Structures are given as structure tokens and as C-alpha cells.
């Protein structure tokens, strides 16, 4: 029972200690491509890079680099591409990735501006009649429809490979209420958002991996993938109480560094799973 464990950590207020154990135990792999001088402007943060072994490669002989990692969860049979919020100069790379990986959905967990500064480039069109064209990767993006709700917005986008004239519908799930500081009060809206993404089929095997990002693509984005996999596993195993969130996180960290950046985010992940289980259980 993780809820029982949850209350113990709370009781003895040892979240930071536990979060630190995970940090210490976390995998560590080379990120040589990410560090090449030629890719300096393709990274938002100097200390956030994709491991070479799990990085997403753009299908171009020029520079195949993009700060994105493929998190493959074998047992849960779920895959996620975690990436950084695109930069002014990497929006075309971003959509090129979405196209080449055949993703069905993009999940955004932050706002373009937070705390008064830019945390992500405006990579999608805001008005139907004003489509976007990424000349460097030869892609066209058009806002087809938008549905603004209280805690999130879902947008229907059309991505066109100008080279082949081929087009695909891309769903953009934007969680718009994540607080500037800290984590949400309750995982309720976050969980609802998660189920909305699921219900769309964007997380399903018939499509490429969903693309998930926030600013660095490790903290909030980690919370999303962690909660989803844990819930899925509790649904798959005949003994749901065997699902160990700390274990799941360490496994995910083998594919991208620093998923879950604070003790608050860790605690929140527990809440989300526990609360999500009480509902998803039936
Ligand atoms: C693995 C390497 C990490 C080493 C530390 N590096 C950093 O914090 C940063 C990168 C970095 C790492 C994690 C961040 N973070 C995230 O959840 C996220 O965006 O992935 C959050 C982190 C903590 C709390 C909240 C958030 C958040 O956005 O919710 C953020 C976002 C902060 C913000 N909202 O302004 C930035 N690098 S640098 C050059 O020192 O600035």
C-alpha cells in the first residue's frame, strides 16, 4: 500500500530524504551529442540533456539533434517522448520530430510565459486564418479548432509535410493551470487532464509516442508519464499494491535525466497515483 507509505513519509516529514535517495540511485549516461558545440543553440538549459542512447534523432543527414528522449516502458507497454519546450530556432525541429515519430498528441504542461519570462516559444498558431510554416523543416501547421476549458485547452491542429503534401491531425493537450511556483493543491484536475489525453488515443500503441514537454521536459513532464504508467500497471498486475512508484521513476530515469525535480513534485506524483487509483480502480 503506497497510501500507507505516503502517510508515513508525511508523518515523519522525510520527503526530501527520500527524493535524495532516488537522485543518488538514479542512472547516469553520456550526452556527448547534446554537448557538441554545434548544438549549443538547440538546448534551452546547459544542465538538461538527453542521453545518447535514448535520444530522438531527426531524420536529416545535416544535424539530427533535438533535445528529446524516448522513454520506453516495457512492462506497461507505454512509450513517451519527453522534450524541452521548443526554442525560437527549434520549432521546426520540434514539428519535424512529431511528424517523423508519427505522434498523435502533444502534451504541454506549462504556459509560454510564467513568472514574467518566456518558458517556451509560441510554436503553434493561435488563429485559424494565420497558419504557420516552418521553412527549415518544410512543414505547415494550421489551427483547426480549439476548446478552452477551466483547467486545460485541447486544440486540433493540422500538420502538413509540404514535401509530400501529406497531412495529419495532431491533438494539442495544454494543461493551463499549473502554478508558477510549487505544485497543484490537488491532483484532481491534473488527473482529469491525463484521462482526457488517454481518451483521445494519443497514448495508445496504434500511434507513435506522445510528445510531452514543459520547460526543461523533466519535472512536470516526469510527473505526467510517471502517474500514467503507475496507474496502468496497477490496472495490469493482479497485485496492484506491488507497483512501486520509486522503482518506476528509477526505471524511467534510465532514459532521461532528472525526471521529477523536487520533493514536492515527488509527493505530488504519489498523490496523483493514490487519488487516481481510487477512481481508476472502478
Ligand atoms: C537535471 C538537471 C537539473 C539541475 C538544475 N537545473 C535547473 O533547475 C535548470 C533547468 C530546469 C530544470 C527543471 C525545471 N522544472 C521542471 O519541472 C521542468 O521544466 O522540467 C522545475 C524544477 C523545480 C521546481 C519546479 C519546476 C517547474 O517548472 O515546475 C525547470 C523550470 C524552472 C522554471 N519553471 O522556471 C528548469 N537549469 S539552470 C541553467 O540551472 O537554470
UniProtKB/Swiss-Prot annotation:
Active-site residues per Swiss-Prot or TrEMBL entry: 214 (phosphocysteine intermediate)
Post-translational modification: Oxidized on Cys-214; the Cys-SOH formed in response to redox signaling reacts with the alpha-amido of the following residue to form a sulfenamide cross-link, triggering a conformational change that inhibits substrate binding and activity. The active site can be restored by reduction.
Mode of membrane association: Peripheral membrane protein
Key word Membrane present: yes
Record-annotated Tyrosine-protein phosphatase domain positions: 2-276
Signal peptide: none
Cross-link (N,N-(cysteine-1,S-diyl)serine (Cys-Ser)): 214-215
Primary location class: endoplasmic reticulum
Function of the molecule: Tyrosine-protein phosphatase which acts as a regulator of endoplasmic reticulum unfolded protein response. Mediates dephosphorylation of EIF2AK3/PERK; inactivating the protein kinase activity of EIF2AK3/PERK. May play an important role in CKII- and p60c-src-induced signal transduction cascades. May regulate the EFNA5-EPHA3 signaling pathway which modulates cell reorganization and cell-cell repulsion. May also regulate the hepatocyte growth factor receptor signaling pathway through dephosphorylation of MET.
Protein's recorded name: Tyrosine-protein phosphatase non-receptor type 1
Amino acid at each position: 500500500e503506497m497510501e500507507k507509505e505516503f502517510e508515513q513519509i508525511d508523518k515523519s516529514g522525510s520527503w526530501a530524504a527520500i527524493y535524495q535517495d532516488i537522485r543518488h540511485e538514479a542512472s547516469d549516461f553520456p550526452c556527448r551529442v547534446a554537448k557538441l558545440p554545434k548544438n549549443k543553440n538547440r538546448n534551452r538549459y546547459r544542465d538538461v540533456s538527453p542521453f545518447d542512447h535514448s535520444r530522438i534523432k531527426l531524420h536529416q543527414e545535416d544535424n539530427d539533434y533535438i533535445n528529446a528522449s524516448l522513454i520506453k516502458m516495457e512492462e506497461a507497454q507505454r512509450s513517451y517522448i519527453l522534450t524541452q519546450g521548443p526554442l525560437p530556432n527549434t520549432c521546426g525541429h520540434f514539428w519535424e520530430m512529431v511528424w517523423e515519430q508519427k505522434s498523435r498528441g502533444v502534451v504541454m504542461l506549462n504556459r509560454v510565459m510564467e513568472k514574467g519570462s518566456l518558458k517556451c516559444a509560441q510554436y503553434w498558431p493561435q488563429k485559424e486564418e494565420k497558419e504557420m510554416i516552418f521553412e527549415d523543416t518544410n512543414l505547415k501547421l494550421t489551427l483547426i479548432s480549439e476548446d478552452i476549458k477551466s483547467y486545460y485547452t485541447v486544440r486540433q491542429l493540422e500538420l502538413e509535410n509540404l514535401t509530400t503534401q501529406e497531412t495529419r491531425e495532431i491533438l494539442h493537450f495544454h494543461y493551463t493551470t499549473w502554478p508558477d511556483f510549487g505544485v497543484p493543491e490537488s491532483p484532481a484536475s491534473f488527473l482529469n487532464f491525463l484521462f482526457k489525453v488517454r481518451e483521445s488515443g494519443s497514448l495508445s500503441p496504434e500511434h507513435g509516442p506522445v510528445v510531452v514537454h514543459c520547460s526543461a521536459g523533466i519535472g512536470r513532464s516526469g510527473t505526467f508519464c510517471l502517474a500514467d504508467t503507475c496507474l496502468l500497471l496497477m490496472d495490469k498486475r493482479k497485485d496492484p499494491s506491488s507497483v512501486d512508484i520509486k522503482k518506476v521513476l528509477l526505471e524511467m530515469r534510465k532514459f532521461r535525466m532528472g525526471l521529477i525535480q523536487t520533493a514536492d513534485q515527488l509527493r505530488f506524483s504519489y498523490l496523483a497515483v493514490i487519488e487516481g487509483a481510487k477512481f481508476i480502480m472502478g
